């Protein structure tokens, strides 16, 4: 019985685990580490003032209720258990219609380490919008932003930080970029605070 051990370890891990409560509800705040890997900077459309992007969005937060002791020390879990534990919500402030792909199964991998550190990546195709200034047409240069923040959580409860050095977080593939008119130049990151 190779699976009878792991099934016990993975049922005891979910026993008494309430997915409605984020880790440390009265204790110290949680800290979600984020990263992005652009697969292909989609076709910018001049008419609609929108642009498409295809990212491998990633998240990594420290949850203490999930730690354990076992032989593997890394669990490569299926795509089903990702909905039974807590997962932070993250919408795009300027997304007209985003879609998450489920090609043959939902494209979400969950890696629960032995310490309690998670990794929860997705795959997204985002039709974000950006305002354009065409006063310098055709010789203009745009800056189309992408602003992803938390939702339902104030600053005192969930705080985002880039996973690696901020200059190297937003990585872009070499051949993935495709554009007819424009030509990608560089990436720039910046964290702020917005009140609503």
């Amino acid at each position, epitope marked *: 019985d190779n699976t009878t051990v792991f099934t016990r370890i993975l049922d005891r891990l979910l026993d008494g685990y309430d997915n409605r409560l984020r880790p440390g509800l009265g204790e110290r705040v949680t800290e979600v580490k984020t990263d992005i890997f652009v697969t292909s900077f989609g076709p910018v459309s001049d008419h609609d003032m929108e642009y498409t992007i295809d990212v491998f969005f990633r998240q990594s937060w420290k949850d203490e209720r999930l730690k354990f002791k076992g032989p593997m020390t890394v669990l490569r879990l299926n795509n089903l258990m990702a909905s039974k534990i807590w997962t932070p919500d993250t919408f795009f402030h300027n997304g007209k219609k985003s879609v998450a792909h489920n090609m043959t199964m939902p494209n979400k991998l969950l890696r629960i380490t032995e310490d309690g550190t998670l990794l929860y990546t997705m795959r997204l195709t985002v039709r974000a919008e950006c305002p354009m200034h065409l006063e310098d047409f055709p010789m203009d240069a745009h800056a189309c932003p992408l602003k992803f923040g938390s939702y339902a959580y104030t600053r005192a409860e969930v705080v985002y*930080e880039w996973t690696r*050095e901020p200059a190297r977080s937003v990585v872009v593939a070499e051949d993935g970029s495709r554009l007819n008119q424009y030509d990608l130049l560089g990436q*720039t990151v910046d*964290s702020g605070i917005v009140q609503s």
Partner: antibody
Amino acid sequence: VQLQQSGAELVKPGASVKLSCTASGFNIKDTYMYWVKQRPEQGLEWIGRIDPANGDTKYDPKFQGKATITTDTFSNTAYLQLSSLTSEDTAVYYCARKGLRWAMDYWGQGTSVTVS
Amino acid sequence: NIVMTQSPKSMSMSVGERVTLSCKASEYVGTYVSWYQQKPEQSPKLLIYGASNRYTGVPDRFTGSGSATDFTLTIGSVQAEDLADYHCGQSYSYPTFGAGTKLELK
């Protein structure tokens, strides 16, 4: 919280010395560890960075190959090894942690190394 | 590599007067610039992280404000024990530090 380092080190040129800062009050596998050296009355300077979980280490190109940073996760300690010491290498060495927007919130006591 | 320029190099002010410091950054660093306070023969502490944010346990007389390249640390009612060295440091990329400003009373 509190960061403890080793005592003073006095060593002649052509010998390797090993400096260590021992963390306490927090698990090291959460945040990175930095190393800043300060000569007498000059601006702070960056040596290298270590990540205890993965193991990746990046160094300042002017110091690359001269100093190697290794960590012992089980003992919760970060080690700094110096090699090819020269007379002008005399300076104070600091251990640092990352936290709250990459700002080095906690700093060690500071170890004094004199090469002569 | 990113280089930080700091001015003035060294200035002295009286007790209870407004004081302005500046740290110029050649490349782009968007609101990831921290300010450290090193007293003589001690360990440098933290005052400002990000920009216009005060680390805990810090008096309110310290205020910051920054942009893509310009940055400014403005002390309020300078007390007696506010004589030390202030270092502007950025962490947008591999972290570097400024030359450092030395503050003496008069």
